[PDB]
C-alpha cells in the first residue's frame, strides 16, 4: 500500500491526466500542464485506455512515479512524453502480433522473430518473465533501425503479457554473450533502445543478468556503478555459472545448452499460424465486451475524481472509495481478459502454452 505523500504524488498526476481529458476535478484540496501541452484529448485518452491490459491503471502510473522519484512535474513530462510516442501504436504492435507482421512480410521483424534473437523462455525465482537474448546471432545487415526498434517493442510486450498479480510486473533479461565477437555488434540500435526503454518503459526491468560472460569484462562494472544510477546498477548482475543461475532462476527454464531441464527448439521457430485467432471475427461480440469496458473506464473516472478530493483521509467514505477503486481495477482486468481473445492475434507464447491471459 501507498503512505499519504505518496497519494498526494498519484492524486497530482490523475488531476493532471483527467485535466487533459477534461473529466471535472477539484485538485485544490489535496490550467493545463505544459509537457501534456500537445496532446489532444479524446485521442490521449482513447489511447492510455486502450494500453490498459493487464495491470492496474494505478500501477501504469506508478511505474512513471517512481522512475522520477516521485517529483511531480518530472514525472508528468516523462509521461505526457511516453503517451506522445506511443499513441496507438504500441497498441497494434501487440494485437497484430506475429501475424500481421508476416502478413506486412516486414522483412527485418521476420528475420529478428525467426532467428530467436530475443524470445521468452520461462519465470525467475520472482516469478517474473525471462528473456533470453544471444547476441551471438545478431548481425546489423539483417534489419533496419526501425524494423530493430519494432521487433524489441513486440518482445517486450509480449512479455508484459505475462504479468502475474501479486508477483513483479517486470522482466527479467539473460544475456547468453558465450559466443559473443565483434562481427555481432551493432551500437546504434542498442543505445536507441536503452533510451527508448529508460524513458518509455520504466520500471520495468527486474534483472539484467549476464551469463558465463567473459571473466575478466564483470571487474570494472564492480566499481563503476557507483557512479551510475544505484537503482538500475542494482538491477545489473553478473553471473558466470548455473550455481549462479540457481540465484535467480529454476532449473527448469533455464535452457539445457547452459545447463537447464528447458528443452524448448531454440533453432527452429513454429510461428503462429493464425488458428487461436478464431475471435478476431466476432465484432458483435468484441464490441459487447468493449462497451462494457468503457461503463468500466467512465466509473473508475468518477471515482478517482471523488477520491482526488473528498476529505477527510479518516473518513468511512474514503475507504469506501478506496474499495471501490480496487474493485473497478479488478473488473477492469479481468474484462480485458474476457477482450483478449477479440483483440489480439494469439502469439507463440499462446500457443505452446506459456502465457494464459
Ligand atoms: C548488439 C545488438 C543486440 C541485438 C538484440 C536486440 C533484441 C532485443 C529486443 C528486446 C529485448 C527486451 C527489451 C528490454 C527491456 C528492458 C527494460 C528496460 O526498459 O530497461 C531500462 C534500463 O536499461 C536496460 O535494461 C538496458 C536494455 C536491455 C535490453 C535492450 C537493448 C539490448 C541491447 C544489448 C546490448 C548488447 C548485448 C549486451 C547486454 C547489455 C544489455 C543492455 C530501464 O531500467 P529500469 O530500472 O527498469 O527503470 C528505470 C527508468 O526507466 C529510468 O528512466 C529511471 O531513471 C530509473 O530510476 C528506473 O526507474
Given at each position: 500500500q501507498l503512505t499519504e505523500d505518496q497519494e498526494v504524488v498519484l492524486k497530482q498526476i490523475w488531476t493532471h491526466l483527467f485535466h487533459l481529458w477534461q473529466?471535472?476535478?477539484?485538485?485544490?484540496?489535496?490550467?493545463?500542464?505544459?509537457?501534456?501541452?500537445?496532446?489532444?484529448?479524446?485521442?490521449?485518452?482513447?489511447?492510455?485506455?486502450?494500453?490498459?491490459?493487464?495491470?492496474?491503471?494505478?500501477?501504469?502510473?506508478?511505474?512513471?512515479i517512481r522512475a522520477r522519484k516521485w517529483n511531480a512535474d518530472k514525472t508528468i513530462a516523462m509521461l505526457g512524453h511516453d503517451l506522445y510516442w506511443r499513441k496507438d501504436t504500441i497498441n497494434k504492435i501487440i494485437n497484430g502480433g506475429e501475424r500481421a507482421v508476416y502478413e506486412n512480410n516486414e522483412t527485418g521483424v521476420i528475420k529478428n522473430l525467426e532467428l530467436q534473437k530475443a524470445t521468452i523462455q520461462g519465470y525467475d525465482n520472482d516469478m517474473r518473465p525471462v528473456i533470453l537474448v544471444r547476441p551471438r546471432l545478431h548481425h546489423s545487415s539483417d534489419q533496419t533501425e526501425q524494423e530493430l526498434e519494432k521487433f524489441s517493442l513486440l518482445v517486450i510486450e509480449q512479455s508484459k503479457l505475462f504479468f502475474k498479480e501479486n508477483y513483479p510486473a517486470s522482466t527479467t533479461i539473460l544475456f547468453d554473450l558465450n559466443g559473443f565477437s565483434m562481427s555481432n555488434m551493432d551500437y546504434a540500435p542498442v543505445k536507441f533502445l536503452i533510451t527508448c526503454f529508460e524513458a518509455h518503459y520504466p520500471e520495468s526491468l527486474g534483472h539484467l543478468l549476464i551469463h558465463k560472460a567473459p571473466w575478466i569484462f564483470n571487474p570494472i562494472w564492480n566499481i563503476i556503478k557507483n557512479w551510475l544510477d544505484p537503482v538500475?546498477?542494482?538491477?545489473?548482475?553478473?553471473?558466470?555459472?548455473?550455481?549462479?543461475?540457481?540465484?535467480?532462476?529454476?532449473?527448469?527454464?533455464i535452457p539445457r545448452y547452459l545447463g537447464g531441464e528447458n528443452d524448448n527448439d531454440l533453432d527452429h521457430y513454429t510461428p503462429p499460424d493464425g488458428s487461436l485467432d478464431v475471435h478476431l471475427k466476432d465484432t458483435e461480440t468484441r464490441a459487447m465486451?468493449?462497451?462494457?469496458?468503457?461503463?468500466?473506464?467512465?466509473?473508475?473516472?468518477?471515482?478517482?475524481?471523488?477520491?482526488?478530493?473528498?476529505?477527510?483521509?479518516?473518513?468511512?467514505?474514503?475507504?469506501?472509495?478506496?474499495?471501490?477503486?480496487?474493485?473497478?481495477?479488478?473488473?477492469?482486468?479481468?474484462?480485458?481478459?474476457?477482450?483478449?481473445?477479440?483483440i489480439r492475434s494469439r502469439s507463440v507464447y499462446d500457443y505452446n502454452g506459456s502465457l494464459k491471459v
Open positions: 473529466v471535472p476535478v477539484d485538485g485544490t484540496h489535496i490550467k493545463i500542464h505544459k509537457a501534456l501541452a500537445n496532446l489532444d484529448p479524446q485521442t490521449t485518452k482513447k489511447q492510455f485506455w486502450h494500453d490498459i491490459k493487464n495491470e492496474t491503471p494505478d500501477a501504469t502510473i506508478l511505474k512513471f538500475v546498477a542494482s538491477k545489473i548482475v553478473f553471473t558466470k555459472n548455473i550455481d549462479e543461475l540457481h540465484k535467480f532462476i529454476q532449473p527448469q527454464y465486451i468493449e462497451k462494457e469496458r468503457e461503463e468500466l473506464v467512465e466509473q473508475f473516472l468518477t471515482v478517482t475524481a471523488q477520491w482526488i478530493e473528498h476529505q477527510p483521509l479518516n473518513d468511512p467514505a474514503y475507504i469506501q472509495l478506496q474499495e471501490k477503486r480496487v474493485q473497478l481495477s479488478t473488473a477492469l482486468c479481468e474484462n480485458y481478459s474476457k477482450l483478449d481473445p477479440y
